[PDB]
Amino acid sequence: GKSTTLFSRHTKAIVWGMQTRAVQGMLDFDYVCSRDEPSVAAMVYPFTGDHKQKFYWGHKEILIP
Amino acid sequence: EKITTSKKPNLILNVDGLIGVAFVDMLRNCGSFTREEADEYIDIGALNGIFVLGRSMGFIGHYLDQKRLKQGLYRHPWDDISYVLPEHM
């Protein structure tokens, strides 16, 4: 079954790839739309191990694996 | 120190000052050193060695931390350098 409500205010994603600029823009969008959590939970890049990237939730800094 | 803190409020003995004076105090003021043995260890530089063997712990701690947080290469971006090369040599 194909859904009819694709996105929501609780939609969580995994972005595939090293796209710090675009995921920075997406977390910027999650902040400016007054959301509670980031839309991005994790990133998947096969050429690098598991670490944490720092991001801006407004002024505060968070870590995304 | 009592004289200098009247000049400015900050002006306190550093820990890099206090270990120097307290270690010369230890050397030439406890036993076991004459004043040509205690002053020879100061003229040679055995007070460099205290700071070096201390700061090796913090350096290896920084090394293990930078490996464990798994950070890649640092590059020092070009808006911190301000190249000042001559005109045409």
mmCIF file with all atom_site columns, C-alpha atoms in Angstrom:
data_model
loop_
_atom_site.group_PDB
_atom_site.id
_atom_site.type_symbol
_atom_site.label_atom_id
_atom_site.label_alt_id
_atom_site.label_comp_id
_atom_site.label_asym_id
_atom_site.label_entity_id
_atom_site.label_seq_id
_atom_site.pdbx_PDB_ins_code
_atom_site.Cartn_x
_atom_site.Cartn_y
_atom_site.Cartn_z
_atom_site.occupancy
_atom_site.B_iso_or_equiv
_atom_site.pdbx_formal_charge
_atom_site.auth_seq_id
_atom_site.auth_comp_id
_atom_site.auth_asym_id
_atom_site.auth_atom_id
_atom_site.pdbx_PDB_model_num
ATOM 1   C CA . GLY A 1 1  ? 0.000  0.000  0.000  1.00 0.00 ? 1  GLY A CA 1
ATOM 2   C CA . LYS A 1 2  ? 1.164  3.467  -0.989 1.00 0.00 ? 2  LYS A CA 1
ATOM 3   C CA . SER A 1 3  ? 0.588  5.975  1.786  1.00 0.00 ? 3  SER A CA 1
ATOM 4   C CA . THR A 1 4  ? -1.279 9.262  1.468  1.00 0.00 ? 4  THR A CA 1
ATOM 5   C CA . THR A 1 5  ? 0.350  11.148 4.356  1.00 0.00 ? 5  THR A CA 1
ATOM 6   C CA . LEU A 1 6  ? 4.028  11.016 3.428  1.00 0.00 ? 6  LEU A CA 1
ATOM 7   C CA . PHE A 1 7  ? 5.447  13.644 5.769  1.00 0.00 ? 7  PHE A CA 1
ATOM 8   C CA . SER A 1 8  ? 4.459  14.844 9.212  1.00 0.00 ? 8  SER A CA 1
ATOM 9   C CA . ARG A 1 9  ? 5.804  16.760 12.157 1.00 0.00 ? 9  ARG A CA 1
ATOM 10  C CA . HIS A 1 10 ? 7.117  13.423 13.491 1.00 0.00 ? 10 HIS A CA 1
ATOM 11  C CA . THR A 1 11 ? 8.734  12.207 10.265 1.00 0.00 ? 11 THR A CA 1
ATOM 12  C CA . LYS A 1 12 ? 12.254 10.899 10.856 1.00 0.00 ? 12 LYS A CA 1
ATOM 13  C CA . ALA A 1 13 ? 14.785 10.328 8.118  1.00 0.00 ? 13 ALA A CA 1
ATOM 14  C CA . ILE A 1 14 ? 18.137 8.869  7.288  1.00 0.00 ? 14 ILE A CA 1
ATOM 15  C CA . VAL A 1 15 ? 20.028 10.809 4.644  1.00 0.00 ? 15 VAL A CA 1
ATOM 16  C CA . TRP A 1 16 ? 22.387 8.619  2.639  1.00 0.00 ? 16 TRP A CA 1
ATOM 17  C CA . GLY A 1 17 ? 25.691 10.311 1.925  1.00 0.00 ? 17 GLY A CA 1
ATOM 18  C CA . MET A 1 18 ? 28.098 13.023 3.083  1.00 0.00 ? 18 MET A CA 1
ATOM 19  C CA . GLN A 1 19 ? 25.854 16.053 2.588  1.00 0.00 ? 19 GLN A CA 1
ATOM 20  C CA . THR A 1 20 ? 26.659 18.365 5.526  1.00 0.00 ? 20 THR A CA 1
ATOM 21  C CA . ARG A 1 21 ? 25.420 21.410 3.587  1.00 0.00 ? 21 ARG A CA 1
ATOM 22  C CA . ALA A 1 22 ? 22.055 19.900 2.678  1.00 0.00 ? 22 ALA A CA 1
ATOM 23  C CA . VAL A 1 23 ? 21.505 18.264 6.064  1.00 0.00 ? 23 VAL A CA 1
ATOM 24  C CA . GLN A 1 24 ? 22.475 21.590 7.643  1.00 0.00 ? 24 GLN A CA 1
ATOM 25  C CA . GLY A 1 25 ? 19.733 23.180 5.556  1.00 0.00 ? 25 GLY A CA 1
ATOM 26  C CA . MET A 1 26 ? 17.269 20.486 6.600  1.00 0.00 ? 26 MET A CA 1
ATOM 27  C CA . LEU A 1 27 ? 18.002 20.876 10.311 1.00 0.00 ? 27 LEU A CA 1
ATOM 28  C CA . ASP A 1 28 ? 17.738 24.626 9.782  1.00 0.00 ? 28 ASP A CA 1
ATOM 29  C CA . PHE A 1 29 ? 14.294 23.967 8.345  1.00 0.00 ? 29 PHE A CA 1
ATOM 30  C CA . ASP A 1 30 ? 13.391 21.798 11.343 1.00 0.00 ? 30 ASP A CA 1
ATOM 31  C CA . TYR A 1 31 ? 14.393 24.615 13.661 1.00 0.00 ? 31 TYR A CA 1
ATOM 32  C CA . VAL A 1 32 ? 12.608 27.374 11.748 1.00 0.00 ? 32 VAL A CA 1
ATOM 33  C CA . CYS A 1 33 ? 9.380  25.376 11.432 1.00 0.00 ? 33 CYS A CA 1
ATOM 34  C CA . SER A 1 34 ? 9.215  25.184 15.273 1.00 0.00 ? 34 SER A CA 1
ATOM 35  C CA . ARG A 1 35 ? 9.582  21.417 15.328 1.00 0.00 ? 35 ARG A CA 1
ATOM 36  C CA . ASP A 1 36 ? 10.519 19.477 18.467 1.00 0.00 ? 36 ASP A CA 1
ATOM 37  C CA . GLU A 1 37 ? 13.078 17.047 17.043 1.00 0.00 ? 37 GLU A CA 1
ATOM 38  C CA . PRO A 1 38 ? 15.354 17.139 14.005 1.00 0.00 ? 38 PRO A CA 1
ATOM 39  C CA . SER A 1 39 ? 14.055 15.466 10.872 1.00 0.00 ? 39 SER A CA 1
ATOM 40  C CA . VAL A 1 40 ? 17.366 13.610 10.519 1.00 0.00 ? 40 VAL A CA 1
ATOM 41  C CA . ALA A 1 41 ? 18.177 10.757 12.875 1.00 0.00 ? 41 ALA A CA 1
ATOM 42  C CA . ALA A 1 42 ? 21.258 9.324  11.203 1.00 0.00 ? 42 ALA A CA 1
ATOM 43  C CA . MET A 1 43 ? 23.485 9.441  8.147  1.00 0.00 ? 43 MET A CA 1
ATOM 44  C CA . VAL A 1 44 ? 24.880 6.517  6.149  1.00 0.00 ? 44 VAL A CA 1
ATOM 45  C CA . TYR A 1 45 ? 28.242 6.875  4.406  1.00 0.00 ? 45 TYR A CA 1
ATOM 46  C CA . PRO A 1 46 ? 30.059 3.610  3.580  1.00 0.00 ? 46 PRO A CA 1
ATOM 47  C CA . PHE A 1 47 ? 33.555 5.146  3.406  1.00 0.00 ? 47 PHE A CA 1
ATOM 48  C CA . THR A 1 48 ? 33.738 6.308  7.035  1.00 0.00 ? 48 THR A CA 1
ATOM 49  C CA . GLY A 1 49 ? 33.093 4.766  10.434 1.00 0.00 ? 49 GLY A CA 1
ATOM 50  C CA . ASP A 1 50 ? 30.401 5.637  12.943 1.00 0.00 ? 50 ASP A CA 1
ATOM 51  C CA . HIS A 1 51 ? 30.923 9.012  14.537 1.00 0.00 ? 51 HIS A CA 1
ATOM 52  C CA . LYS A 1 52 ? 28.896 12.059 15.516 1.00 0.00 ? 52 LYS A CA 1
ATOM 53  C CA . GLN A 1 53 ? 28.499 15.243 13.513 1.00 0.00 ? 53 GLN A CA 1
ATOM 54  C CA . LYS A 1 54 ? 27.765 18.504 15.291 1.00 0.00 ? 54 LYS A CA 1
ATOM 55  C CA . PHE A 1 55 ? 24.802 20.568 14.198 1.00 0.00 ? 55 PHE A CA 1
ATOM 56  C CA . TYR A 1 56 ? 22.948 23.678 15.190 1.00 0.00 ? 56 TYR A CA 1
ATOM 57  C CA . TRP A 1 57 ? 19.532 23.489 16.807 1.00 0.00 ? 57 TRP A CA 1
ATOM 58  C CA . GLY A 1 58 ? 19.263 27.245 16.750 1.00 0.00 ? 58 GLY A CA 1
ATOM 59  C CA . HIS A 1 59 ? 22.287 28.173 18.784 1.00 0.00 ? 59 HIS A CA 1
ATOM 60  C CA . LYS A 1 60 ? 22.665 24.930 20.686 1.00 0.00 ? 60 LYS A CA 1
ATOM 61  C CA . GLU A 1 61 ? 24.822 22.144 19.290 1.00 0.00 ? 61 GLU A CA 1
ATOM 62  C CA . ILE A 1 62 ? 23.616 18.561 18.894 1.00 0.00 ? 62 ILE A CA 1
ATOM 63  C CA . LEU A 1 63 ? 25.208 15.326 17.698 1.00 0.00 ? 63 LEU A CA 1
ATOM 64  C CA . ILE A 1 64 ? 23.867 13.156 14.872 1.00 0.00 ? 64 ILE A CA 1
ATOM 65  C CA . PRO A 1 65 ? 25.405 9.704  14.244 1.00 0.00 ? 65 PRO A CA 1
ATOM 66  C CA . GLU B 2 1  ? 53.831 38.568 45.215 1.00 0.00 ? 1  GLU B CA 1
ATOM 67  C CA . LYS B 2 2  ? 52.726 40.902 48.024 1.00 0.00 ? 2  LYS B CA 1
ATOM 68  C CA . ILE B 2 3  ? 54.617 43.693 46.297 1.00 0.00 ? 3  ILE B CA 1
ATOM 69  C CA . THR B 2 4  ? 53.310 42.932 42.812 1.00 0.00 ? 4  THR B CA 1
ATOM 70  C CA . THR B 2 5  ? 49.611 42.513 43.620 1.00 0.00 ? 5  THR B CA 1
ATOM 71  C CA . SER B 2 6  ? 49.578 46.135 44.740 1.00 0.00 ? 6  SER B CA 1
ATOM 72  C CA . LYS B 2 7  ? 50.550 47.055 41.175 1.00 0.00 ? 7  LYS B CA 1
ATOM 73  C CA . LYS B 2 8  ? 47.690 45.184 39.506 1.00 0.00 ? 8  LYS B CA 1
ATOM 74  C CA . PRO B 2 9  ? 45.018 42.759 40.690 1.00 0.00 ? 9  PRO B CA 1
ATOM 75  C CA . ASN B 2 10 ? 45.937 40.019 38.237 1.00 0.00 ? 10 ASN B CA 1
ATOM 76  C CA . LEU B 2 11 ? 49.714 39.719 38.756 1.00 0.00 ? 11 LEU B CA 1
ATOM 77  C CA . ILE B 2 12 ? 49.740 36.597 40.894 1.00 0.00 ? 12 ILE B CA 1
ATOM 78  C CA . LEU B 2 13 ? 52.415 33.917 40.999 1.00 0.00 ? 13 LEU B CA 1
ATOM 79  C CA . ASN B 2 14 ? 51.729 31.525 38.151 1.00 0.00 ? 14 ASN B CA 1
ATOM 80  C CA . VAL B 2 15 ? 51.813 27.822 38.687 1.00 0.00 ? 15 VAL B CA 1
ATOM 81  C CA . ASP B 2 16 ? 54.705 28.054 36.226 1.00 0.00 ? 16 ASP B CA 1
ATOM 82  C CA . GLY B 2 17 ? 56.295 30.494 38.617 1.00 0.00 ? 17 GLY B CA 1
ATOM 83  C CA . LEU B 2 18 ? 55.428 28.669 41.791 1.00 0.00 ? 18 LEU B CA 1
ATOM 84  C CA . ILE B 2 19 ? 56.719 25.264 40.731 1.00 0.00 ? 19 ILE B CA 1
ATOM 85  C CA . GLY B 2 20 ? 59.978 26.931 39.705 1.00 0.00 ? 20 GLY B CA 1
ATOM 86  C CA . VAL B 2 21 ? 60.545 28.665 43.008 1.00 0.00 ? 21 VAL B CA 1
ATOM 87  C CA . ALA B 2 22 ? 59.244 25.728 45.051 1.00 0.00 ? 22 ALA B CA 1
ATOM 88  C CA . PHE B 2 23 ? 61.405 23.266 43.187 1.00 0.00 ? 23 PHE B CA 1
ATOM 89  C CA . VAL B 2 24 ? 64.551 25.326 43.638 1.00 0.00 ? 24 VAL B CA 1
ATOM 90  C CA . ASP B 2 25 ? 63.369 25.521 47.249 1.00 0.00 ? 25 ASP B CA 1
ATOM 91  C CA . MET B 2 26 ? 63.203 21.716 47.298 1.00 0.00 ? 26 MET B CA 1
ATOM 92  C CA . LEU B 2 27 ? 66.603 21.307 45.655 1.00 0.00 ? 27 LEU B CA 1
ATOM 93  C CA . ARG B 2 28 ? 68.826 23.860 47.387 1.00 0.00 ? 28 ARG B CA 1
ATOM 94  C CA . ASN B 2 29 ? 66.818 23.896 50.630 1.00 0.00 ? 29 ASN B CA 1
ATOM 95  C CA . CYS B 2 30 ? 66.348 20.246 51.507 1.00 0.00 ? 30 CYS B CA 1
ATOM 96  C CA . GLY B 2 31 ? 69.408 18.042 51.977 1.00 0.00 ? 31 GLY B CA 1
ATOM 97  C CA . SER B 2 32 ? 71.319 15.906 49.442 1.00 0.00 ? 32 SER B CA 1
ATOM 98  C CA . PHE B 2 33 ? 72.522 18.835 47.309 1.00 0.00 ? 33 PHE B CA 1
ATOM 99  C CA . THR B 2 34 ? 75.393 21.093 48.097 1.00 0.00 ? 34 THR B CA 1
ATOM 100 C CA . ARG B 2 35 ? 75.079 24.340 46.222 1.00 0.00 ? 35 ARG B CA 1
ATOM 101 C CA . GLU B 2 36 ? 77.240 23.197 43.359 1.00 0.00 ? 36 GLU B CA 1
ATOM 102 C CA . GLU B 2 37 ? 75.047 20.174 42.872 1.00 0.00 ? 37 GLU B CA 1
ATOM 103 C CA . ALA B 2 38 ? 71.733 22.003 43.252 1.00 0.00 ? 38 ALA B CA 1
ATOM 104 C CA . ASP B 2 39 ? 72.813 24.889 41.057 1.00 0.00 ? 39 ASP B CA 1
ATOM 105 C CA . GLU B 2 40 ? 74.229 22.522 38.483 1.00 0.00 ? 40 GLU B CA 1
ATOM 106 C CA . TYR B 2 41 ? 70.828 20.852 38.124 1.00 0.00 ? 41 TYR B CA 1
ATOM 107 C CA . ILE B 2 42 ? 69.317 24.302 37.566 1.00 0.00 ? 42 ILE B CA 1
ATOM 108 C CA . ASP B 2 43 ? 72.008 25.383 35.103 1.00 0.00 ? 43 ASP B CA 1
ATOM 109 C CA . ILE B 2 44 ? 71.538 22.152 33.161 1.00 0.00 ? 44 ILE B CA 1
ATOM 110 C CA . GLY B 2 45 ? 67.773 22.468 32.982 1.00 0.00 ? 45 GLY B CA 1
ATOM 111 C CA . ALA B 2 46 ? 66.161 19.856 35.223 1.00 0.00 ? 46 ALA B CA 1
ATOM 112 C CA . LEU B 2 47 ? 63.184 22.219 35.598 1.00 0.00 ? 47 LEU B CA 1
ATOM 113 C CA . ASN B 2 48 ? 62.369 21.839 31.915 1.00 0.00 ? 48 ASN B CA 1
ATOM 114 C CA . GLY B 2 49 ? 62.014 18.127 32.583 1.00 0.00 ? 49 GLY B CA 1
ATOM 115 C CA . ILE B 2 50 ? 59.246 18.516 35.131 1.00 0.00 ? 50 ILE B CA 1
ATOM 116 C CA . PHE B 2 51 ? 57.044 20.395 32.694 1.00 0.00 ? 51 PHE B CA 1
ATOM 117 C CA . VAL B 2 52 ? 57.871 17.944 29.906 1.00 0.00 ? 52 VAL B CA 1
ATOM 118 C CA . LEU B 2 53 ? 57.135 14.762 31.847 1.00 0.00 ? 53 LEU B CA 1
ATOM 119 C CA . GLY B 2 54 ? 53.970 16.383 33.144 1.00 0.00 ? 54 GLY B CA 1
ATOM 120 C CA . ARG B 2 55 ? 52.680 17.569 29.788 1.00 0.00 ? 55 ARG B CA 1
ATOM 121 C CA . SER B 2 56 ? 53.379 14.249 28.070 1.00 0.00 ? 56 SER B CA 1
ATOM 122 C CA . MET B 2 57 ? 50.344 12.834 29.889 1.00 0.00 ? 57 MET B CA 1
ATOM 123 C CA . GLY B 2 58 ? 48.110 15.564 28.521 1.00 0.00 ? 58 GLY B CA 1
ATOM 124 C CA . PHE B 2 59 ? 49.536 15.206 25.042 1.00 0.00 ? 59 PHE B CA 1
ATOM 125 C CA . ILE B 2 60 ? 48.880 11.468 24.916 1.00 0.00 ? 60 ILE B CA 1
ATOM 126 C CA . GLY B 2 61 ? 45.435 12.147 26.347 1.00 0.00 ? 61 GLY B CA 1
ATOM 127 C CA . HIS B 2 62 ? 44.814 14.523 23.464 1.00 0.00 ? 62 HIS B CA 1
ATOM 128 C CA . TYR B 2 63 ? 46.103 11.904 21.013 1.00 0.00 ? 63 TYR B CA 1
ATOM 129 C CA . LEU B 2 64 ? 43.841 9.151  22.343 1.00 0.00 ? 64 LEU B CA 1
ATOM 130 C CA . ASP B 2 65 ? 40.914 11.554 22.393 1.00 0.00 ? 65 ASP B CA 1
ATOM 131 C CA . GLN B 2 66 ? 41.430 12.669 18.796 1.00 0.00 ? 66 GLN B CA 1
ATOM 132 C CA . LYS B 2 67 ? 41.669 9.074  17.698 1.00 0.00 ? 67 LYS B CA 1
ATOM 133 C CA . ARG B 2 68 ? 38.648 7.967  19.710 1.00 0.00 ? 68 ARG B CA 1
ATOM 134 C CA . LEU B 2 69 ? 36.389 10.762 18.521 1.00 0.00 ? 69 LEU B CA 1
ATOM 135 C CA . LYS B 2 70 ? 37.470 9.579  15.051 1.00 0.00 ? 70 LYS B CA 1
ATOM 136 C CA . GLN B 2 71 ? 38.038 12.969 13.513 1.00 0.00 ? 71 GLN B CA 1
ATOM 137 C CA . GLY B 2 72 ? 39.568 13.311 10.076 1.00 0.00 ? 72 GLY B CA 1
ATOM 138 C CA . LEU B 2 73 ? 42.337 15.632 8.925  1.00 0.00 ? 73 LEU B CA 1
ATOM 139 C CA . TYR B 2 74 ? 42.469 19.262 10.037 1.00 0.00 ? 74 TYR B CA 1
ATOM 140 C CA . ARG B 2 75 ? 43.200 21.808 7.333  1.00 0.00 ? 75 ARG B CA 1
ATOM 141 C CA . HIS B 2 76 ? 43.224 25.365 8.872  1.00 0.00 ? 76 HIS B CA 1
ATOM 142 C CA . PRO B 2 77 ? 40.944 27.323 6.511  1.00 0.00 ? 77 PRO B CA 1
ATOM 143 C CA . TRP B 2 78 ? 42.299 30.107 4.341  1.00 0.00 ? 78 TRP B CA 1
ATOM 144 C CA . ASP B 2 79 ? 40.553 32.929 6.191  1.00 0.00 ? 79 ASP B CA 1
ATOM 145 C CA . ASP B 2 80 ? 43.007 32.725 9.073  1.00 0.00 ? 80 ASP B CA 1
ATOM 146 C CA . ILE B 2 81 ? 46.330 33.068 7.247  1.00 0.00 ? 81 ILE B CA 1
ATOM 147 C CA . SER B 2 82 ? 46.546 36.454 5.424  1.00 0.00 ? 82 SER B CA 1
ATOM 148 C CA . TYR B 2 83 ? 49.386 35.818 2.985  1.00 0.00 ? 83 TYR B CA 1
ATOM 149 C CA . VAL B 2 84 ? 51.760 38.783 2.850  1.00 0.00 ? 84 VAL B CA 1
ATOM 150 C CA . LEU B 2 85 ? 54.075 37.730 -0.049 1.00 0.00 ? 85 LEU B CA 1
ATOM 151 C CA . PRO B 2 86 ? 56.275 40.308 -1.867 1.00 0.00 ? 86 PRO B CA 1
ATOM 152 C CA . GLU B 2 87 ? 55.276 42.000 -5.105 1.00 0.00 ? 87 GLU B CA 1
ATOM 153 C CA . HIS B 2 88 ? 57.391 40.428 -7.860 1.00 0.00 ? 88 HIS B CA 1
ATOM 154 C CA . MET B 2 89 ? 60.829 39.125 -6.923 1.00 0.00 ? 89 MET B CA 1
#
